[PDB]
Amino acid sequence: MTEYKLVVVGAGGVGKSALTIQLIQNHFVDEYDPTIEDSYRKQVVIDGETCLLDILDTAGQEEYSAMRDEYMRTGEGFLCVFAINNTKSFEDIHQYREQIKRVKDSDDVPMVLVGNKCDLAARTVESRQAQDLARSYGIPYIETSAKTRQGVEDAFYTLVREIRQH
Amino acid sequence: MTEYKLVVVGAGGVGKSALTIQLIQNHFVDEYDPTIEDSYRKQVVIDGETCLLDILDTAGQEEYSAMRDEYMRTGEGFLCVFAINNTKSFEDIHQYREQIKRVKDSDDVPMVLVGNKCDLAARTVESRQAQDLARSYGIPYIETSAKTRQGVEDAFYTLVREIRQH
Amino acid sequence: MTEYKLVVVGAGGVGKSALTIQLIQNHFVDEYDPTIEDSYRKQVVIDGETCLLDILDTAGQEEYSAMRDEYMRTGEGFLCVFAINNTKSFEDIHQYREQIKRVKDSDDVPMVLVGNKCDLAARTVESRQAQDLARSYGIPYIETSAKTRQGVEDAFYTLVREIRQH
Amino acid sequence: MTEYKLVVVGAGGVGKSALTIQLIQNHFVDEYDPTIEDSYRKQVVIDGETCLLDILDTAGQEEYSAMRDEYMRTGEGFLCVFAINNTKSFEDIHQYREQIKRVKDSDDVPMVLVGNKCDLAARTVESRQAQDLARSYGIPYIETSAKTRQGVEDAFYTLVREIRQH
Amino acid sequence: MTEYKLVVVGAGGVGKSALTIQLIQNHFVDEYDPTIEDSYRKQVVIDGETCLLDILDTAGQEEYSAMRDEYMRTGEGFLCVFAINNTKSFEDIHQYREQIKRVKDSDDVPMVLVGNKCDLAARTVESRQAQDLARSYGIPYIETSAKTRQGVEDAFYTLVREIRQH
Amino acid sequence: MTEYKLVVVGAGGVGKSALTIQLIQNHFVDEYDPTIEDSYRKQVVIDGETCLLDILDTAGQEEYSAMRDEYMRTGEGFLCVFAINNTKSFEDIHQYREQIKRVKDSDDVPMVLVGNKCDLAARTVESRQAQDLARSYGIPYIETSAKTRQGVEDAFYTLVREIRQH
Ligand SMILES: Nc1nc2c(ncn2[C@@H]2O[C@H](COP(=O)(O)OP(=O)(O)NP(=O)(O)O)[C@@H](O)[C@H]2O)c(=O)[nH]1
Ligand SMILES: Nc1nc2c(ncn2[C@@H]2O[C@H](COP(=O)(O)OP(=O)(O)NP(=O)(O)O)[C@@H](O)[C@H]2O)c(=O)[nH]1
Ligand SMILES: Nc1nc2c(ncn2[C@@H]2O[C@H](COP(=O)(O)OP(=O)(O)NP(=O)(O)O)[C@@H](O)[C@H]2O)c(=O)[nH]1
Ligand SMILES: Nc1nc2c(ncn2[C@@H]2O[C@H](COP(=O)(O)OP(=O)(O)NP(=O)(O)O)[C@@H](O)[C@H]2O)c(=O)[nH]1
Ligand SMILES: Nc1nc2c(ncn2[C@@H]2O[C@H](COP(=O)(O)OP(=O)(O)NP(=O)(O)O)[C@@H](O)[C@H]2O)c(=O)[nH]1
Ligand SMILES: Nc1nc2c(ncn2[C@@H]2O[C@H](COP(=O)(O)OP(=O)(O)NP(=O)(O)O)[C@@H](O)[C@H]2O)c(=O)[nH]1
Ligand SMILES: [Ca+2]
Ligand SMILES: [Ca+2]
Ligand SMILES: [Ca+2]
Ligand SMILES: [Ca+2]
Ligand SMILES: [Ca+2]
Ligand SMILES: [Ca+2]
Ligand SMILES: [Ca+2]
Ligand SMILES: [Ca+2]
Ligand SMILES: [Ca+2]
Ligand SMILES: [Mg+2]
Ligand SMILES: [Mg+2]
Ligand SMILES: [Mg+2]
Ligand SMILES: [Mg+2]
Ligand SMILES: [Mg+2]
Numbered sequence: 001m002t003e004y005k006l007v008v009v010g011a012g013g014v015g016k017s018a019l020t021i022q023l024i025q026n027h028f029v030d031e032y033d034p035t036i037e038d039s040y041r042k043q044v045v046i047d048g049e050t051c052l053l054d055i056l057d058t059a060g061q062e063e064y065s066a067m068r069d070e071y072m073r074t075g076e077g078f079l080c081v082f083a084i085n086n087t088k089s090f091e092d093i094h095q096y097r098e099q100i101k102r103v104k105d106s107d108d109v110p111m112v113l114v115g116n117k118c119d120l121a122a123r124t125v126e127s128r129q130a131q132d133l134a135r136s137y138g139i140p141y142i143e144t145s146a147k148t149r150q151g152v153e154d155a156f157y158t159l160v161r162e163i164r165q166h
Numbered sequence: 167m168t169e170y171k172l173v174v175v176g177a178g179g180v181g182k183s184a185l186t187i188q189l190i191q192n193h194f195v196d197e198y199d200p201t202i203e204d205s206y207r208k209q210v211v212i213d214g215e216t217c218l219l220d221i222l223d224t225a226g227q228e229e230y231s232a233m234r235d236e237y238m239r240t241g242e243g244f245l246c247v248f249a250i251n252n253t254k255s256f257e258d259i260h261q262y263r264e265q266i267k268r269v270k271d272s273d274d275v276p277m278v279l280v281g282n283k284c285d286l287a288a289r290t291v292e293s294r295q296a297q298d299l300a301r302s303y304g305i306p307y308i309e310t311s312a313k314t315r316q317g318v319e320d321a322f323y324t325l326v327r328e329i330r331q332h
Numbered sequence: 333m334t335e336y337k338l339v340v341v342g343a344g345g346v347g348k349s350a351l352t353i354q355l356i357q358n359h360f361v362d363e364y365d366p367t368i369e370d371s372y373r374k375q376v377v378i379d380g381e382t383c384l385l386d387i388l389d390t391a392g393q394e395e396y397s398a399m400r401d402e403y404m405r406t407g408e409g410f411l412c413v414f415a416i417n418n419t420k421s422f423e424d425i426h427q428y429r430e431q432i433k434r435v436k437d438s439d440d441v442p443m444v445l446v447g448n449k450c451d452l453a454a455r456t457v458e459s460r461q462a463q464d465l466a467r468s469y470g471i472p473y474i475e476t477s478a479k480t481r482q483g484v485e486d487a488f489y490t491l492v493r494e495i496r497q498h
Numbered sequence: 499m500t501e502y503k504l505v506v507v508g509a510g511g512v513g514k515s516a517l518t519i520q521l522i523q524n525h526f527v528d529e530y531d532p533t534i535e536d537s538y539r540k541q542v543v544i545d546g547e548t549c550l551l552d553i554l555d556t557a558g559q560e561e562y563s564a565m566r567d568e569y570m571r572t573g574e575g576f577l578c579v580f581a582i583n584n585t586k587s588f589e590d591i592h593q594y595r596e597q598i599k600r601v602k603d604s605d606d607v608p609m610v611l612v613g614n615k616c617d618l619a620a621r622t623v624e625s626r627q628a629q630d631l632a633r634s635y636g637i638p639y640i641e642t643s644a645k646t647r648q649g650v651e652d653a654f655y656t657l658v659r660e661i662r663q664h
Numbered sequence: 665m666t667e668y669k670l671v672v673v674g675a676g677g678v679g680k681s682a683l684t685i686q687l688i689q690n691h692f693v694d695e696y697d698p699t700i701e702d703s704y705r706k707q708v709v710i711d712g713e714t715c716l717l718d719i720l721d722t723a724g725q726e727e728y729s730a731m732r733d734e735y736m737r738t739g740e741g742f743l744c745v746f747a748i749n750n751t752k753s754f755e756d757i758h759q760y761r762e763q764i765k766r767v768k769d770s771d772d773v774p775m776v777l778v779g780n781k782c783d784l785a786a787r788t789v790e791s792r793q794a795q796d797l798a799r800s801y802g803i804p805y806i807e808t809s810a811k812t813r814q815g816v817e818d819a820f821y822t823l824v825r826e827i828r829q830h
Numbered sequence: 831m832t833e834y835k836l837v838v839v840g841a842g843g844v845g846k847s848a849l850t851i852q853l854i855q856n857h858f859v860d861e862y863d864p865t866i867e868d869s870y871r872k873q874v875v876i877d878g879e880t881c882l883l884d885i886l887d888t889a890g891q892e893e894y895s896a897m898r899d900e901y902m903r904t905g906e907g908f909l910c911v912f913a914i915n916n917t918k919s920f921e922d923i924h925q926y927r928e929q930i931k932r933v934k935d936s937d938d939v940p941m942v943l944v945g946n947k948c949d950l951a952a953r954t955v956e957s958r959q960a961q962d963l964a965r966s967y968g969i970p971y972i973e974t975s976a977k978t979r980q981g982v983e984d985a986f987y988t989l990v991r992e993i994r995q996h
């Protein structure tokens with residue numbers, strides 16, 4: 001059984017925890033409790049391979065972000081999450097990518113760009129803009145909703161498929 | 167490092183998930199999303215011993231309870247949870263204990279009786295009544311609030327201390 | 333290398349130990365020493381797979397049967413043995429199956445029904461009667477002689493082949 | 499948990515198997531079935547240490563002795579067994595010790611000399627004669643009966659205590 | 665058995681390989697063959713603890729230094745080596761420390777400053793100057809000669825003792 | 831990942847260490863420092879299989895040869911090395927083969943005969959003479975130079991290919 005260590009990063013409130021909990025526990029967390037550092041483990045079959053996902057759900061609030069770098073350092077692949085109704089969270093992605101490069105000491109780290117909250121209509125980040133950012137990084141862009149489950153499995157399983165290309 | 171497998175059982179809505187999430191993630195879940203079967207892992211030091219807790223959070227809703235027995239079978243100790251404002255959940259404890267005895271094939275299984283929601287004032291189960299039930303089973307009774315954290319560490323760590331007496 | 337944990341159960345004197353010793357050590361035990369709980373381990377190739385058999389030989393005498401359930405609980409597949417010259421041992425099978433279901437908490441446990449001592453002529457259980465019992469359980473019936481080796485490998489290897497269908 | 503690999507060697511018929519079976523299974527084998535190569539495993543507490551004994555019961559009959567050296571090579575300590583009513587088996591000990599030295603490539607191998615069948619009265623090897631042989635090898639001499647259990651635990655546990663001095 | 669991963673870094677020609685080979689193989693390498701990336705493993709008892717040292721001997725020549733950072737990243741403690749007859753190698757230490765901080769993402773990494781070639785008399789780095797540098801980093805300074813063995817065990821074992829304080 | 835334990839034996843000065851260091855570290859050791867007992871480990875892909883080579887470089891000088899047999903005992907395959915400009919080292923091979931047979935207690939041990947220093951012209955052992963010796967042992971003969979790298983990978987990888995035929 002193969003183990004994949006995935007790390008979910010991005011600004012406070014973008015839905016990192018809700019995405020992870022939807023994937024692992026199959027329900028939507030409606031309330032907002034800021035995360036420090038939480039981990040989840042689940043055995044799943046992905047493309048015919050039985051494997052063990054260890055998912056680290058990290059803090060996006062600056063106040064709660066103590067030692068986040070020590071956690072990010074352990075990851076094999078990163079979901080870089082912004083919310084499509086939060087322009088600042090999209091602009092912040094650059095800084096999370098720089099932190100990832102820093103903690104892995106590599107310019108070649110498996111990553112997927114995720115635009116979450118796609119069930120909401122106050123979109124300020126258009127798909128094409130995010131596609132362009134992801135293209136500049138050489139990674140896929142996927143839209144998700146932790147509320148409806150749209151794209152959730154695809155985002156996480158795509159990250160595993162990116163780690164496998166590394 | 168020693169591993170302890172703990173299983174949290176009890177009627178729907180009594181606060182099994184909220185207790186587990188408060189212990190592992192240090193926040194209170196205010197909303198009610200019924201659980202199927204979720205697991206959590208955390209390394210903690212308990213009485214000077216570094217150990218790994220694997221906590222299984224089980225379904226209390228009959229509808230979601232498919233295969234709960236297959237999960238309970240793996241446990242080394244059980245938190246049997248009722249809510250102090252839910253007389254039926256207290257009366258139900260007998261049936262959870264019988265299920266535990268069934269799946270472990272033993273009359274001697276480490277267990278703690280937990281009266282949760284002790285922050286609420288619509289108490290219908292008095293402390294002495296629960297103490298008496300626990301005494302009949304030869305186990306401790308502890309009151310908790312997942313909301314205020316009262317008793318939460320004590321309940322889980324007491325269960326580890328009971329497993330160590332086995 | 334795959335490990336299969338096999339458990340041999342059945343009434344006192346039916347030949348559980350003699351079957352196990354013939355398989356593992358290639359000789360026939362002529363004397364009768366009642367078993368408490370013995371274990372055997374052997375690496376064998378079964379259908380091209382190298383694997384490790386752990387065989388638990390259990391007590392059939394009521395007097396020696398203390399804690400048999402604790403041993404049966406660990407098994408992945410069960411040989412349920414009666415002797416073809418012992419009608420009572422055949423009638424007892426029902427009770428061993430019920431115990432297996434109890435300790436595994438499943439109605440779907442890999443099992444093979446074994447009619448031992450087929451080298452003897454005081455047959456009181458006819459093949460068709462045992463075939464019918466096994467059919468009702470959804471399992472194979474195989475006749476063996478620990479004395480001549482007839483059916484011995486087939487019985488144990490069939491049990492492995494049943495575990496593989498589970 | 500510490501593992502000790504013990505090997506039992508000596509002439510055909512001296513009681514190697516009966517000693518091993520008495521230790522592991524707590525009964526006396528009255529019949530004589532010559533051994534090829536059999537192994538037994540048991541967890542036991544010896545002087546407060548929980549450990550795993552792997553006991554190899556070897557062939558003493560020349561006819562069955564094919565590849566015995568390949569088995570002896572793996573052992574950490576050896577019980578060198580003769581029978582007190584079989585002078586030839588005592589005279590043969592020299593050759594088993596030479597084989598042990600050969601397969602371990604050492605003149606310093608943990609060993610115990612065992613005079614078995616001490617329940618029988620046709621003694622042709624007197625205690626003092628065996629004590630002298632053991633003294634020349636720098637090892638203990640212990641008398642045993644697989645039939646009455648006299649000395650059986652002492653012989654095997656003494657061998658573990660000799661391995662611990664190595 | 666505890667494993668310590670040690671990494672030896674410093675300018676080309678300062679004696680990293682000679683130090684490591686003297687420790688592990690007990691001879692002095694007189695010739696100069698520039699290293700790419702070599703590893704050594706040895707079980708040793710240090711202060712009563714049996715442990716496994718994995719020592720990574722890295723390139724100091726810029727030409728051979730491809731991917732050195734990927735190797736340094738794995739280390740638990742670093743020997744930062746300069747030669748006492750090579751002022752430039754001492755001035756270079758700052759840059760190796762910065763690289764270590766970079767690859768470990770920490771300002772608190774176990775390290776020892778080593779002034780090698782102390783058997784030579786063309787000293788251009790005085791002890792006090794190196795002591796001052798080490799003091800500024802909060803680490804020990806030790807002088808060594810790979811040729812005479814002076815200080816060699818002390819340097820490596822001191823690094824283990826620093827890792828144990830971390 | 832498969833592990834192969836290789837042991838390099840032969841007379842003092844024939845180039846055992848130089849061969850091993852050329853394979854593992856890709857440089858030529860020009861000086862002569864007699865070996866006691868050194869070990870090297872490297873992960874390599876051989877015929878599409880990722881594996882771990884553990885190479886034991888042994889003493890050829892009689893003075894340094896204490897306990898060489900204890901080291902040789904652990905090996906899965908042996909490189910038996912002589913130098914093509916050292917007739918005595920070739921005549922000595924017989925004795926190393928006898929020692930190998932002794933420590934492995936087998937007449938069937940994976941081995942390759944290696945004629946090293948083939949870059950030198952003072953040849954006193956002709957290829958055909960060594961081919962004949964190897965033929966009598968049922969093993970390959972390969973010529974090497976640790977100085978030029980000729981045959982070095984072939985010798986070690988051939989030994990792995992011989993172990994795989996065992
Ligand atoms: N409509 C909608 N709301 C969402 C979605 N994902 C998250 N939310 C909501 O957004 C809020 C924040 O979600 P959360 O997952 O806690 O965010 P986070 O990124 O983990 N925050 P932090 O970094 O502070 O831990 C919650 O109220 C949650 O319900 C989504 O896809 N759609
Ligand atoms: N005031 C208060 N509310 C609590 C406490 N524990 C849980 N609750 C609330 O009770 C509801 C049910 O909690 P939850 O933990 O989901 O219950 P559960 O036992 O896991 N239910 P299920 O068996 O269906 O999974 C939630 O609204 C939660 O906030 C507590 O200690 N105090
Ligand atoms: N003729 C014949 N005798 C057999 C056969 N199998 C066992 N026996 C004999 O039946 C007796 C009991 O055998 P044994 O294997 O000890 O039975 P068991 O089922 O292990 N008994 P227990 O439950 O008390 O341990 C012995 O005398 C043995 O030789 C067989 O196939 N044929
Ligand atoms: N009276 C008595 N008989 C014994 C004792 N130990 C063994 N025997 C008997 O001696 C015979 C041979 O015993 P066994 O253990 O098979 O000998 P072995 O050394 O294992 N023989 P092999 O080398 O051929 O496998 C059996 O009949 C057994 O009952 C003992 O302590 N006392
Ligand atoms: N006198 C003396 N010479 C030394 C000492 N240590 C190393 N040398 C010599 O200095 C030269 C370089 O040594 P080496 O260990 O190869 O250096 P390095 O730091 O590993 N070099 P690189 O970074 O290129 O691999 C060799 O000629 C070696 O003998 C020492 O303590 N004293
Ligand atoms: N020209 C040449 N010299 C070689 C070759 N292999 C080794 N040498 C030289 O021969 C000497 C001895 O080499 P070394 O590898 O130390 O031999 P060894 O067999 O390991 N000796 P020991 O048994 O004492 O450890 C060194 O000077 C080395 O450079 C080779 O292929 N060609
Ligand atoms: Ca919800
Ligand atoms: Ca970094
Ligand atoms: Ca909350
Ligand atoms: Ca017999
Ligand atoms: Ca049961
Ligand atoms: Ca008997
Ligand atoms: Ca030998
Ligand atoms: Ca030298
Ligand atoms: Ca060189
Ligand atoms: Mg969060
Ligand atoms: Mg816009
Ligand atoms: Mg729940
Ligand atoms: Mg009341
Ligand atoms: Mg039996």
Ligand SMILES: [Mg+2]
Binds near residue numbers: 456
């Ligand atoms: Mg009838």
Ligand SMILES: [Mg+2]
Binds near residue numbers: 516556557
């Ligand atoms: Mg025997």
Ligand SMILES: [Mg+2]
Binds near residue numbers: 622
């Ligand atoms: Mg006499």
Ligand SMILES: [Mg+2]
Binds near residue numbers: 680681682697698722
């Ligand atoms: Mg070097």
Ligand SMILES: [Mg+2]
Binds near residue numbers: 788
């Ligand atoms: Mg100066």
Ligand SMILES: [Mg+2]
Binds near residue numbers: 848864890
């Ligand atoms: Mg050498």
Ligand SMILES: [Mg+2]
Binds near residue numbers: 954
């Ligand atoms: Mg000639």
